[model samples]
Target: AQNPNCNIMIFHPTKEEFNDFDKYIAYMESQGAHRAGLAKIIPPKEWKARETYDNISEILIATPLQQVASGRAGVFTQYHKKKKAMTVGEYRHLANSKKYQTPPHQNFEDLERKYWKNRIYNSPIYGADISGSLFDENTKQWNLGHLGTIQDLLEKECGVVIEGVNTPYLYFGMWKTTFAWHTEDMDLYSINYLHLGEPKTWYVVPPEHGQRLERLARELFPGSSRGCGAFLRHKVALISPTVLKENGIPFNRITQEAGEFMVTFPYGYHAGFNHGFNCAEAINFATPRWIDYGKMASQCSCGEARVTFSMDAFVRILQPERYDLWKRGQD
Candidate 1:
């Protein structure tokens, strides 16, 4: 069993070793989680301080309607639009379409400019977490190893850990790309690293309050529906910090700047938005502490599985190998 610590942790790297991926990984492995690691890893340099984001944004900013349409990934909306999940080009194109031109849509360039200028939510460029792919090729220089995360370290120490896809998914955040309130898959730990951009504002509910928030959300979501479609996917209801506060549920807020990592612990309820255009990478990991909730998340119809149920069975196979245990506070 792991030792207990009751706090969200933050780490800042110093010296040349912090710049080295090997050294960074070593540092992360050595630091065990208290309840769960809600760490903000601040690197020495801005991870996105390079020209990659600028170049990509420049290209997209001026991309011809014809060209952008062919590069579609997945596009959802912060507001009502019949076209959910269209290509970025198509989405922008539709914004200027005569049929869609209801006060907002006008001309091509004008609509595009206005949208980016005051975009609240739109399509997102996703799938950077796919193996061998990156939003910016230069990011290849910085290795984000899966095993280096504290969750994996604990998993390695105990036989109870089962991992899902370790690859980090890249997110292209705009002013309106709102990630509604939700928990990481199966109560596992999640880490988000902002490669570059303006910044992201975050709101989090501590672990103990998570279940209560979920219960409150289920009760409140239906009544508060604001003309949005119910897609049958049991998405977590958006619980604003103001509402949580009114209900006497405590939560915290932080603005994640460029080159910073935000980690969420098991059952940590979180939601956030991008200040402007930016790119970030997020992935999930698990440890023995997550076993109970992990199983519950998988069995529950409302939630999607982050780490597959088979993972629990697979980790049990290696139970005999655990020796140098990773206890929470001792190490």
Candidate 2:
């Protein structure tokens, strides 16, 4: 059977190609590309040479935060658990304290070294660039269009934090750090950019095949019961694209190299692995069409509701002229 679902696309555009943000967005919408890539935007070595890259840990380490750690060291494929209920800042103190460093003891520092060595778990300082203003070397200014036209404006208005909370999340990864298959909650879109680092290989199932994959998932691993749009509610398994191909489930595969951007539509199931050490960024967004889907997604009711600006909020904020333009089907 032909793997007919080619929902993913890779595009290589020049820096000047993105100069007109409006035209760039029009180009993307024309291609119907859920995931797009460019071989070069900024290289890993180049990105790491910046000051913003160094401030991540310096800021996160001092602030009490949440991080995910593997339950079993060195066994990444096995089931992992979130770290014990403690703020990340607290863990930092304990890890550095005399008790953890006492003779014949593995302190938090030891834990960091061990996990960092095993490459199974991480303490990623996230949400640093909530505005999605990634730097552009050629222009010497941040390209709001890099993240997409809509998200850029949204961030400009919403600010990095919502109700005093950070909106954009940061991520750092080394070899074998994995993200299980799941779609964005409430039918919002997501964009992941590799500022610099080893490539991250992705397995993507389009919104069309999401159901089939979920049904087959329940069969392969029993106890997955729900109409919720996300998989791995109870367990995390690394489902490879090859496995999906063998099962006749249509999907796409791509290796997002440094400076490449990967995007996913609402309910497009995706998962991937970081090949080597890297620093990346991600943020969620919703366009006008996302309203109906958000209503549907809320009914799924999986996990705690991820509160965000509702459609009503957007509708209220739209300028009357723009609202009329939309009403006239001109926007």
Candidate 3:
């Protein structure tokens, strides 16, 4: 069976629309654009590019190796338990040193063969909570915390910063490094912006097909699924588009370049690998409608052990008036 052709919506927002982030999201939602699971927003090329961690070259970071030995159909099955620690400069040098015999657009087999020979490990400095990191000082203009769409609702209303959800987290990526299939915590919407460097390829499954995707993943890795309904939250499984198509799961792929933003809607399952070295930041945000999904996530047994923000607390704080109304009715 051939891979199904699906296109992710790409919006080239004008400066005004881009700055008024909430309005743009509302418009997109009105247009039913959320059905796509993920959408790309490309700001005008004339926008000033923010400086990233180009100056902090000597900082040390840990990287996990995507063990090719355990890979299935050219996709990594799991990350090696051990981590390699190296300076950012050293990782960047290693990332750029590899000259691929096959371009990114080539068939998976050839790319994997080229990748196997190089043995490039994905070095991502994920979850660098930006409260005091170098990232906090730089890139304020488009910082996730500063964005109207994210801050106006999550931060201003909720009164507490939920690390990696409301507060932005920085991520550094290198070639062949991958983020496994998973939705954002609490199924909240997430936006990822590639600050600089090489492009990233994203594979996103719409919310409608989320069940089919989960069923296939469970069938593929039953051991991981045992007693864990939200097993994908483990973030270790990686299935290629070829496997997805063969299994009849509809999905879309998009290449996210620097200066672009990728937004993942609630319950949109996404996974992808970096093309080369890149710097990106992401944060989860919730609208009024996300409360239902948050409630659902809270009830799931798989998330019971993990520390998550309290949806009840957030709602109480964010909408005291509504909370009062509901409480009065209950009384």
Q: Pick the candidate with the highest lDDT.
A: 3
lDDT of 2 by residue, 1-331 (tens): 1223344655555556745534544465566654321112332233232344533433332222223444344322334333334333343345445532212325433433443354444443212223333344444322323334334444565553222222455555544556666667555677666776556777778776677777767655543344333435322544555467778877766677776766667767777665545656676665555455544542223532223443323333433333343223311
lDDT (Cα atoms) of all candidates against the true structure: 0.49, 0.48, 0.65
| Positional deviation of residue 229's Cα in model 1 after best superposition, in angstroms | 20
Tell me how many residue pairs clash in candidate 1.
Answer: 4
Off by over 4 Å in 3: 1-6, 49-53, 62-71, 74-76, 80-84, 98-141, 148-165, 298-331
Which candidate, 2 or 3, has the higher lDDT? Answer: 3
lDDT of 3 by residue, 121-165 (tens): 433323222332334545434457565444355655546664333
| Model 1's TM-score against the true structure | 0.58
Q: Which structure among the candidates has the greatest TM-score?
A: 3
The residue pairs that clash in candidate 3, if any, are none
Better of 2 and 3 by TM-score: 3
* Candidates 1 and 2, the one with greater TM-score: 2
Q: After TM-score superposition, what is the CA distance of residue 173 in candidate 1 from its true location, in Å?
A: 1.4
Which candidate would rank higher by lDDT, 1 or 3? 3
